[PDB]
Every structure is written in structure tokens, then in C-alpha cells.
């Protein structure tokens, strides 16, 4: 399994593939690892399905409740800190998971969160089994002067690469770009597979 959050100009793009497996037994071809968590924010799950899912629901709600009572959307670093508190508070019987939460408030953001509530923001980062491979290509071709369209391609490339060198990852890769203009929008499957073909990639 592999996910990736990438920051650029005035947007943040997040994508993941979706094969869920049990050791070498790839039991589920179409899991979901990308979730909208608020009007202007998304999150990527990676690790044990049980812990991740419950975690997504808590976060999802915790955010909606916050919005209503405060009349304004929770800032990204705030969501990241909240999460950070939850996880660390139970470090000795941790949610075996690794979360990536991207979004845009006053500016774009992307934070990496570990099972101990360690939270750190980067301009891009990957999460999951195939992390290295993507970190390889991103390290090689990412540039903060890219257009949201260039971005969406780089990402697909990044994931398709990890799909090659990592048996744990696989299936249809899916992306969502979140901008202040349009908000959190997930790209149409077709359009994605279209870019794949165009790029001469595979699967």
C-alpha cells in the first residue's frame, strides 16, 4: 500500500492506490485509502485497516462538530495537532497506523503523523509500503513551480512506480486535488486511467 501528499503553489494533491492484502494473499482489490475529512481537507490511511477506519470516523465527526460550534473550519495544523494528541495519549497500546493529512486553510499543508503522535509538516511526503520508491521519483522530479496538472501526473507516475517494485501495492490508483477555489475534489476514475495510458504507464 502506498499514499502520497504533495504541496504546490495554491493546491495540495493526495493520491493512493488501493490493494488491501493479508501477507501475500491479496484479498481485496479495491479498498479505499483516500478520504475527504472536511470541506478543505483530506486524509490518507495506511497500516492496519481496523485502527485506520475507526480513526477516520472519529476525525470526520470531530471536525464537523468543531465547524458547527466555532462557525469556521478547523485549521490544518490544528487537525494535525488534535490527531497528534490522540495517538500519543495511547502510545503504549497504539493505533497501529500511519496517517497523512493534507488540506488548505490560509495556505496549503501536508502533515505526516506516526503511531506515537509525532507530527511533522513537509512540502510533500509519502506513506506506506511503497514509500521509498515514490520518495525516489519525487526526490528526482518534484518542483514547487509545477502546475496542478503537472502535479497530478507526477503523482500517478510516483504511485505507478511503487506499484512495480512493491507487491503489497496495487490496483487502480486514485487522486484528489484540493484547492481553495473549488475545494476538495476527487478526480474521475476515467480521467485518471486516461492520464495513465497517455503517460504510457500501466494498470
Amino acid at each position: 500500500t502506498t499514499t502520497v501528499g504533495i504541496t504546490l503553489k495554491d493546491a495540495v494533491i493526495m493520491a493512493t492506490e488501493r490493494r488491501v492484502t493479508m501477507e501475500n494473499f491479496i484479498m481485496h482489490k479495491n479498498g479505499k485509502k483516500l478520504f475527504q475529512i472536511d470541506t478543505y481537507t483530506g486524509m490518507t490511511i495506511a497500516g492496519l485497516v481496523g485502527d485506520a477506519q475507526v480513526l477516520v470516523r472519529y476525525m470526520k465527526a470531530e471536525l464537523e462538530l468543531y465547524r458547527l460550534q466555532r462557525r469556521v473550519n478547523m485549521p490544518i495544523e490544528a487537525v494535525a495537532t488534535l490527531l497528534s494528541n490522540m495517538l500519543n495519549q495511547v502510545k503504549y497500546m497504539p493505533y497501529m497506523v500511519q496517517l497523512l493529512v493534507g488540506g488548505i486553510d490560509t495556505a496549503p499543508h501536508v502533515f505526516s503523523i506516526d503511531a506515537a503522535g509525532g507530527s511533522v509538516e513537509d512540502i510533500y511526503a509519502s506513506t506506506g509500503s511503497g514509500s521509498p520508491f515514490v520518495y525516489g521519483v519525487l526526490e528526482s522530479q518534484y518542483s514547487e513551480k509545477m502546475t496542478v496538472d503537472e502535479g497530478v501526473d507526477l503523482v500517478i507516475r510516483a504511485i505507478s512506480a511503487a506499484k512495480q517494485r512493491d507487491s503489497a501495492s496495487g490496483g487502480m490508483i486514485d487522486v484528489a486535488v484540493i484547492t481553495r477555489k473549488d475545494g476538495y475534489v476527487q478526480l474521475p476514475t476515467d480521467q485518471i486511467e486516461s492520464r495513465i495510458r497517455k503517460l504510457g504507464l500501466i494498470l
Binding site: 470516523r57 472519529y58 465527526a61 464537523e64 462538530l65 458547527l68 460550534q69
Partner: protein
């Protein structure tokens, strides 16, 4: 100088006294219409020094369900937040607030508890929940006694008896939104309008298929 117990005639005087407090509350109403439901409250303002809109009477519980309250303001607020988190709770366990009726029942039971558990004053407030659920557009009201009922249209607060009678008479079943809000505002007017000026009413609505819509100052002023 006695309690929350039964009078020789079978009545909880404390709960009655409570009801009094709600009558002295502002007036608001709602009704089901075309393919949604709307809520409207009389936003009666005083000083130029108040922060206008901040005194929101129609409050959201979640993007698909709102409620408006009448009675001891403090009591109303705390009882609102309870419903809010209570709402969240059903969402997080079941994955979806399928039946709104249930949401109101929980908050109702909360209120019913103070109706009998000795040392504690009841909630001096009544409110109505409106929204569209798995079943469709739904309208409920609740009093300090914990009594809850579903309506086609209703009101609460000060001018209840009045406005309710108007509807009781001129309520039109499947009235399309524009006409429904009108009938409503007209009904609200007549009632509390012993004092002529309707001032600036607060109105919001939702229709099956989508989230709630709060009417903007000008839009409401259009029906005003």
C-alpha cells in the same frame, strides 16, 4: 416550597411552571412543504449595540438537521449542544443518522429524566427539530416535559396559539417553497404582530436531496 411530585390532581407543578417560562419565549414556527421543510423565527432586536446575526435562533445540528428553541436561553443552548454531540454519536457508530426521530427522542429522554430524579430543576425550554432524514422531511417539537410529536406544521414560543391557529386554518399541504415561506411569514406576522412591525425574521430551509440553506438578509427582506 415543595417539589417535583404529583399534585392531588395528578400534575407535576414544577413542569407546569417550567412551561410558563417557554411561553415568555420568542415566537418561531416551521412546516413541511413541497419536498423539504422550513424553519422561521422572529428575530426581535433591541439595541444598536447588539451584534446582529450573532443572535442566531435557528441553529444547525448537522448539515441536514436544524432546530429552533424557546424558553430559558441558557437551558436551550446546553440542550442544543447535547443533541449535537448526540447526533455525532449515532453517526460514528452506525455510520449514518438514518432516523432523525431518534435524535429528538434521545434529547427528549434527557429532559424526561429531570422530570423525576429528585434534586434537580427541569429544563425550562421547548424546541423543534426540522430536517430531512432517511424517511424524508421531518418535523418535531418538544416541551420541558419530554413530550415529543411530529407535525405537518407548527409553532412555539410566545405567539404559539395564535400562529398555530392561522396555519390550522390556512395551511396548504404541498405548498411550493416560495409560497410556503410566504404563508409562514404571513402566519408569523398576524400572531406576534399585535405590535405591527415584523422586524427582521430569521428563516432557513432545506429540501430533500441536499443540505440546509440559511436565507440571507436581503432574501428574507424580499418576503418581508
Amino acid at each position: 416550597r415543595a417539589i417535583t411530585v404529583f399534585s392531588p390532581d395528578g400534575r407535576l407543578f414544577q413542569v407546569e411552571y417550567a412551561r410558563e417560562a417557554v411561553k415568555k419565549g420568542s415566537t418561531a414556527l416551521g412546516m413541511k412543504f413541497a419536498n423539504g421543510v422550513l424553519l422561521i423565527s422572529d428575530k426581535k432586536v433591541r439595541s444598536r449595540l447588539i451584534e446582529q446575526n450573532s443572535i442566531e435562533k435557528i441553529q444547525l445540528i448537522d448539515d441536514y438537521v436544524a432546530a429552533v428553541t424557546s424558553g430559558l436561553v441558557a437551558d436551550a443552548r446546553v440542550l442544543v449542544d447535547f443533541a449535537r454531540i448526540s447526533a455525532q454519536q449515532e453517526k460514528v457508530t452506525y455510520g449514518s443518522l438514518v432516523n432523525i426521530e431518534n435524535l429528538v427522542k434521545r434529547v427528549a429522554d434527557q429532559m424526561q429524566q429531570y422530570t423525576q430524579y429528585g434534586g434537580v430543576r427541569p429544563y425550562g425550554v421547548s424546541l423543534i427539530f426540522a430536517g430531512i432524514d432517511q424517511i424524508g422531511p421531518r418535523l418535531f417539537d418538544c416541551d420541558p416535559a419530554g413530550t415529543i410529536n411530529e407535525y405537518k406544521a407548527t409553532a412555539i414560543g410566545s405567539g404559539k396559539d395564535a400562529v398555530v391557529s392561522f396555519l390550522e386554518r390556512e395551511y396548504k399541504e404541498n405548498l411550493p417553497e416560495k409560497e410556503a415561506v410566504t404563508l409562514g411569514i404571513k402566519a408569523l406576522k398576524s400572531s406576534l404582530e399585535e405590535g405591527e412591525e415584523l422586524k427582521a425574521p430569521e428563516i432557513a430551509s432545506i429540501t430533500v436531496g441536499n443540505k440546509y440553506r440559511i436565507y440571507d438578509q436581503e432574501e428574507v427582506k424580499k418576503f418581508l
